[PDB]
Design a protein around this ligand. Structure first.
Ligand SMILES: O=c1[nH]cnc2c(-n3cc(CCN4CCC(c5ccc(CCN6CCOCC6)cc5)CC4)cn3)nccc12
Ligand SMILES: [Cl-]
Ligand SMILES: [Zn+2]
Ligand SMILES: [Zn+2]
Length: 337
C-alpha cells in the first residue's frame, strides 16, 4: 500500500464523509499516511458555512510580518508581530499592488517566483487566530469538534484561522507532539504544500542540523520554532524524498504523525486548522522530541498509555519501553478495511 509514499487525493461520498475518524482510518488502510500528507475533496453538496460575507470586522489579534533571510535555497523566517487588524484591512493590503499575487501561466512559474522573491517585500500573515468559520449545525468534519481520542487531554484541541496573502509561508515542521492536523481552505487563492514522508523525516532533520548547527546546539528540536525554509531544489540536491500538492478552496489537507510539511499561500485566502489523534499517534506522542529552549506545547502521555497501552504502562514509566515505530503501518482502527 502506497510504496512510493506519494500524496494521495480522496473523493469521499456523503455517506463515507459523515464519519471523520472512520474515513481517516480508511485513507490509512490505502497507505495515505506514508506521504505524510493527504488531500480530501469533500462531496460537492457539502459546505461548512453559507457565505463568508460577514467577517470584515473579524479581528486578527496578532498579524505577523514575515521577514525571510537567506540564499541558495536555505532561509530563516523572522516574525514581527504587528498590531491587531480586521479581515477588511488585511484583504485591502493582500489585494493591493504592493502585495498582490504576480501574473503567471502555470503553478511552476508562481513556485519559481516564490523561491526567487521570498526575501523581498515581507508579507503579513494573519496567522493563529483563535476561531472557526464553521456554522454550529455542521456535523461533518467540524474542525472545532472532531471528537477524536485527543479530546482526552481536555489548548491545541481548539481551531485556528489563517488569513494569507501572496508569499506568506509556513516553515518546515511536524505538528506539536507529532500529532495529526486537518486544514480546510475556506476561501480564496490556493495554498501550496511540500511534504517529506514520515519514514524520511530523520534525513530532513539531519540535513537541517548540518545547515543550522548553531540552532541545533541551542535546541534539539529547533524545526519546531517554525523558522526554517528549505527549497525543493535543496531537498532534491541532498536526496531528501518529498512531494508537492496545491490545495484549492473547499479542500482539506491531512498531515499525519511525524509528517514534515512547509508551503506558501498564492494570495488572499482563509484556512482553518486543529490537531487530532488516532490510536496510532499515542506511540509517536511518547517518542516525540520536544523544543527545550522555549517555555512550547507539551501533552502528558500518561493518560493515553494507561487507557490504550495498560500492558506497557509500568515498563514505559520505568523507561524499559524500547518500541521502534514503523511509519508504514496503518492505524489499528483501519482493521475493518
Ligand atoms: O498554512 C499554514 N499556515 C500556518 N500554519 C500552518 C501549519 N501549522 C501551524 C502550526 C502552529 C499551531 N499553533 C502547526 N502547524 N501547518 C500547516 C499549514 C499551516
Ligand atoms: Cl472575504
Ligand atoms: Zn502544520
Ligand atoms: Zn527550541
Amino acid at each position: 500500500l502506497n510504496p512510493s509514499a506519494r500524496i494521495m487525493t480522496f473523493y469521499p461520498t456523503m455517506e463515507e464523509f459523515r464519519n471523520f475518524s472512520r474515513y481517516i482510518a480508511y485513507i490509512e488502510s490505502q497507505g495515505a499516511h506514508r506521504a505524510g500528507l493527504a488531500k480530501v475533496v469533500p462531496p460537492k453538496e457539502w459546505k461548512p458555512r453559507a457565505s463568508y460575507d460577514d467577517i470584515d470586522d473579524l479581528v486578527i489579534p496578532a498579524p505577523i510580518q514575515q521577514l525571510v533571510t537567506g540564499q541558495s535555497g536555505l532561509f530563516t523566517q523572522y516574525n514581527i508581530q504587528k498590531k491587531a487588524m480586521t479581515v477588511r484591512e488585511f484583504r485591502k493590503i493582500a489585494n493591493s499592488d504592493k502585495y498582490c499575487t504576480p501574473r503567471y501561466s502555470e503553478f511552476e512559474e508562481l513556485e519559481r517566483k516564490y523561491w526567487k522573491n521570498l526575501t523581498f517585500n515581507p508579507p503579513i500573515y494573519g496567522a493563529d487566530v483563535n476561531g472557526t468559520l464553521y456554522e454550529k449545525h455542521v456535523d461533518e468534519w467540524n474542525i472545532g469538534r472532531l471528537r477524536t481520542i485527543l479530546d482526552l487531554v481536555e489548548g491545541v484541541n481548539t481551531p485556528y484561522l489563517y488569513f494569507g496573502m501572496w508569499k506568506t509561508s509556513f516553515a518546515w515542521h511536524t505538528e506539536d507532539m507529532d500529532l495529526y492536523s486537518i486544514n480546510y481552505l475556506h476561501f480564496g487563492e490556493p495554498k501550496s504544500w511540500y511534504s517529506v514522508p514520515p519514514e524520511h523525516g530523520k534525513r530532513l532533520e539531519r540535513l537541517a542540523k548540518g545547515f543550522f548547527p548553531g540552532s541545533a546546539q541551542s535546541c534539539e528540536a529547533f524545526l519546531r520554532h517554525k523558522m526554517t525554509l528549505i527549497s525543493p531544489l535543496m531537498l532534491k540536491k541532498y536526496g531528501i524524498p518529498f512531494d508537492k500538492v496545491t490545495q484549492e478552496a473547499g479542500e482539506f489537507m491531512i498531515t499525519f504523525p511525524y509528517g514534515y510539511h512547509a508551503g506558501f499561500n498564492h494570495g488572499f485566502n482563509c484556512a482553518e486548522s486543529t490537531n487530532f489523534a488516532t490510536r496510532r499517534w499515542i506511540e509517536y506522542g511518547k517518542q516525540a522530541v520536544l523544543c527545550s529552549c522555549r517555555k512550547m506545547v507539551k501533552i502528558s502521555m500518561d493518560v493515553f498509555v494507561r487507557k490504550f497501552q495498560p500492558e506497557r504502562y509500568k515498563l514505559w514509566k520505568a523507561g524499559k519501553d524500547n518500541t521502534v515505530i514503523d511509519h508504514t503501518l496503518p492505524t489499528p482502527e483501519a482493521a475493518e478495511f
